Amino acid sequence: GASRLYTLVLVLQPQRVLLGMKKRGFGAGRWNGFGGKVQEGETIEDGARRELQEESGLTVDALHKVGQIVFEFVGEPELMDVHVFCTDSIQGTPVESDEMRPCWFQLDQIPFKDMWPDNSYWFPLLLQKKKFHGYFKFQGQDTILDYTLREVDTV
Ligand SMILES: Nc1nccc(-c2ccccc2)n1
């Protein structure tokens, strides 16, 4: 139990990607994919489907495994084991809530400066349909102290 399970879901269409602006709590003020903690009795993929609906209002059909990223925050005991998914098959339209504001971005207008800093490293892989394993050591939420990132054939 050194790490806690999380999901992160990117809705990636041929010309655009859906990102969410978190309004409070962890990650507030930044754009990111949609995700959160996997629950008891829930598969990781079912947790990803649930998080996407709760945070964006979208219903996902097929989810595709694209990556695994472990995050360490100095001073915090629990590692975040984030399972990253992508989908191009969604139903519904995005919903803004008290917690989250979704927005579509053209792929050449992705807001890297107002995202989690690790996204600048692995988004290029996601956009070219590559799979990856990563680890990022953070000091606070703005500084990457160390990282590793490698492309894989199997997530
Ligand atoms: N891009 C990024 N960077 C750091 C952390 C996260 C995160 C995502 C979902 C759930 C918990 C943490 N995402």
Swiss-Prot record:
Reported effect, residue 52 to P: Loss of activity
Binding residue positions for Mg(2+) 1: 35, 55, 99
Residue sites binding Mg(2+) 2 per the record: 51, 54
E.C. numbers: 3.6.1.56, 3.6.1.-
Residues that coordinate or bind 8-oxo-dGTP: 7, 22, 32, 34-37, 116-119
GO CC terms of this entry: cytoplasm; cytosol; mitochondrial matrix; mitochondrion; nucleus
Catalytic reaction equation(s): 2-oxo-dATP + H2O = 2-oxo-dAMP + diphosphate + H(+); 2-oxo-ATP + H2O = 2-oxo-AMP + diphosphate + H(+); 8-oxo-dGTP + H2O = 8-oxo-dGMP + diphosphate + H(+); 8-oxo-dATP + H2O = 8-oxo-dAMP + diphosphate + H(+)
SUPFAM superfamilies hit by this protein: Nudix
Annotated positions binding 8-oxo-ATP: 26, 34-37, 51, 55, 116-119
Effect of residue 149 to A: Reduces 2-oxo-dATPase and 8-oxo-dGTPase activities and increases thermolability
pH effect on activity, per entry: Optimum pH is 7.8-8.2 with 8-oxo-dGTP as substrate, and 8.0-8.5 with 2-oxo-dATP as substrate.
Residues that bind 8-oxo-dGMP: 7, 22, 32, 116-119
GO function terms (MF aspect): 2-hydroxy-ATP hydrolase activity; 2-hydroxy-dATP hydrolase activity; 8-oxo-7,8-dihydrodeoxyguanosine triphosphate pyrophosphatase activity; 8-oxo-7,8-dihydroguanosine triphosphate pyrophosphatase activity; ATP diphosphatase activity; dATP diphosphatase activity; hydrolase activity, acting on acid anhydrides, in phosphorus-containing anhydrides; metal ion binding
Residue ranges of domain Nudix hydrolase in the record: 2-131
Post-translational modification: The N-terminus is blocked.
Pfam families membership: NUDIX
Binding residues annotated for O(6)-methyl-dGMP, in chain numbering: 7, 22, 32, 116-119
A biological-process GO annotation: DNA protection
Keywords attached to this entry: Cytoplasm, Hydrolase, Magnesium, Metal-binding, Mitochondrion, Nucleus, RNA-binding, Transit peptide
Domain of life according to the entry: Eukaryota
Record note on what altering residue 152 to A does: Reduces 2-oxo-dATPase and 8-oxo-dGTPase activities and increases thermolability
Effect on the protein of changing residue 38 to E: Loss of activity
Subunit structure: Monomer.
Family of this protein: Belongs to the Nudix hydrolase family.
Name this polypeptide is given: Oxidized purine nucleoside triphosphate hydrolase
